[PDB]
Amino acid sequence: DTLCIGYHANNSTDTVDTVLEKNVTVTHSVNLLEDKHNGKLCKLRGVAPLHLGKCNIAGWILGNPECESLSTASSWSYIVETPSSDNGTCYPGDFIDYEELREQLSSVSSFERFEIFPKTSSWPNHDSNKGVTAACPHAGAKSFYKNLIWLVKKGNSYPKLSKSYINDKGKEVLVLWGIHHPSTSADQQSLYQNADTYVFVGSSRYSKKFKPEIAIRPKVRDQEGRMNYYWTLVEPGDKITFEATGNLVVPRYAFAMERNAGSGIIISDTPVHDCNTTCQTPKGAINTSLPFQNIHPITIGKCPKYVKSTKLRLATGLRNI
Amino acid sequence: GLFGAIAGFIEGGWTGMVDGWYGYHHQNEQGSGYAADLKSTQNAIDEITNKVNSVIEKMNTQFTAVGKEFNHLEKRIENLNKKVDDGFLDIWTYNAELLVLLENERTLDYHDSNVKNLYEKVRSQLKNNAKEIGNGCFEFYHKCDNTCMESVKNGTYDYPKY
Ligand SMILES: *[C@@H]1O[C@H](CO)[C@@H](O[C@@H]2O[C@H](CO)[C@@H](O)[C@H](O)[C@H]2NC(C)=O)[C@H](O)[C@H]1NC(C)=O
Ligand SMILES: *[C@@H]1O[C@H](CO)[C@@H](O[C@@H]2O[C@H](CO)[C@@H](O)[C@H](O)[C@H]2NC(C)=O)[C@H](O)[C@H]1NC(C)=O
Ligand SMILES: *[C@@H]1O[C@H](CO)[C@@H](O)[C@H](O)[C@H]1NC(C)=O
Ligand SMILES: *[C@@H]1O[C@H](CO)[C@@H](O)[C@H](O)[C@H]1NC(C)=O
């Protein structure tokens, strides 16, 4: 009559490492490392990402003729840009504090586009129709940004204009405008008859006077002239004034906007999807409880920590025999 | 590995015993078979479970959007940013790798311990009434049937015999 004691074993082939020994076969274990994404740009909280498709942030906000058909939204958790998006600033120029703009737009609570300066009642002493160019083509025809109006002089006249809008909204308003720098002094008087002109844009916080820099730049999209793009956020109850003797690409549409800090912009080809996720990567979303992931370093949301590990198998069972 | 039991004086495990992690194999006149220790296996599972839950549950990350955008004239902050990313990467990789290693050595030692303890609990209970073989097995001098089995398992072993 015998009564002994021992342990457990099986067909398990799981191997773990210890401080003292490598490749030790164990009966049971679990993986602490996540290495599997759904390959979908799933949404974050329950809000969907703003996918720009063929356009970038610049093109979308300025109103590039191509960036027509994506923007019927009110909010987004983050912004998605495709690596093959190039429809941005069709007219050559510098977008001042562009990266900053993108960061601020990365996540928006509410977002409505309203006409701040209606084309037809606001610019009565200037031509608001001749402001097109071959640089911003809409099906062959010469067009321009939708959200901006390129004000040229009406039949040999450009009186000092002076419009000013006051934020009657209950949220900040993103106002964009442009300063055009003609290539030649002949182009200058051709567009806004005066030779020595100036633009001034001011609010309770913003204030700057612009002097047109007339010169010949290397042709980019047929234009030897440049166009600098500016923006600002006018506070609720605050007003922004414009004042120009020429060269002012005036705002047409502004954006009532309530933003929440702490999101980003993913540049990826991956498909946008109707799905829920708590952690988003450029390659796909992560649905995980595990502490670590080796999928991608760049991440958005509440994600596992990025590790360079290939495997992190944790032993749960004992040895195997 | 540390308590001399598993892969020690008991060199082998029982594919046969599939009820728990630790358990006996009786060999009396009413038959044979394996029987996993109820209380021991249950506690181990609970505690090992708690162990796994801790390593996981203690990871409450902040809502952050890694990755920033810098223009050609901001290569310096771009590299600063890259540095903070490569720093966290090195810390977390190293810590995670060693956490698993260290814990894996504790887990096997934990199991090894429970076996040793099960053996000892039986041994300090049968004293003269049986002898050690050395293979984690005892030999009874006194006829031990099935209900004479359990008194050992239940830990309720009388002592009137020879
Ligand atoms: C993931 O997003 C959230 C979960 O937090 C869910 O949100 C609602 O889904 C219903 C069903 O269509 C809608 O009627 C609600 O309006 C959604 N909420 C919001 C904020 O709009 C959503 O259903 C989840 N989707 C999946 C695929 O799990
Ligand atoms: C949208 O982006 C594409 C990417 O360049 C632009 O494509 C070009 O289209 C214009 C319009 O005539 C041509 O002049 C170029 O030669 C095209 N490039 C190629 C590859 O042929 C397109 O212009 C953009 N849309 C607009 C109107 O800005
Ligand atoms: C031993 O296990 C380690 C896991 O750290 C693995 O990298 C390695 O390839 C294994 N070596 C052999 C010979 O199986
Ligand atoms: C994904 O998330 C759901 C809801 O939390 C969860 O029940 C499920 O286990 C997850 N599936 C995957 C892909 O692991």
Report on the structure:
The complex is a heterodimer of chains A (321) and B (162). Chain A has 321 residues and is mostly beta strands. Chain A has two domains: 1-41 and 274-321, Hemagglutinin Chain A, Domain 2 (Hemagglutinin, Chain A, domain 2), CATH 2.10.77; 42-273, Haemagglutinin, alpha/beta domain, HA1 chain (Hemagglutinin (Ha1 Chain), Chain: A, domain 1, Alpha-Beta Complex), CATH 3.90.209. Chain A contains four helices and 27 strands. Chain A has helices at 57-62, 98-105, 119-122, 185-191, and strands at 2-8, 15-16, 24-25, 29-31, 33-34, 41-43, 50-51, 79-81, 108-115, 133-138, 141-143, 148-150, 164-166, 172-181, 199-202, 207-210, 226-234, 239-244, 248-251, 253-259, 265-267, 272-276, 279-280, 292-293, 300-301, 305-306, 313-315. In chain A, strands 9, 12, 14, 17, 19 and 20 form a six-stranded antiparallel β-sheet that branches. In chain A, strands 13-18-15-16 form a four-stranded antiparallel β-sheet, with no helix packed on it. A three-stranded parallel β-sheet of chain A has the order 5-24-26, with no helix packed on it. With 162 residues, chain B is α+β, with helices and mostly antiparallel strands. Chain B has a single domain (1-162), classed as Hemagglutinin Ectodomain, Chain B (Alpha-Beta Complex), CATH 3.90.20.10. In chain B, 48% of the residues lie in helices and 14% in strands. Chain B has three helices and six strands. Chain B has helices at 38-57, 75-123, 146-153; strands at 13-14, 23-28, 31-36, 64-65, 130-132, 137-140. In chain B, the strands form two sheets. A two-stranded antiparallel sheet of chain B has the order 2-3. Chain B has a two-stranded antiparallel ribbon with strand order 5-6. The two termini of chain B are 37 Å apart. Chains A and B meet through strand 1, helix 2, strand 25, strand 26 and strand 27 of A and strand 1, strand 2, helix 1, strand 4 and helix 2 of B. One 2-acetamido-2-deoxy-beta-D-glucopyranose is lined by residues 17, 22-23 of chain A.
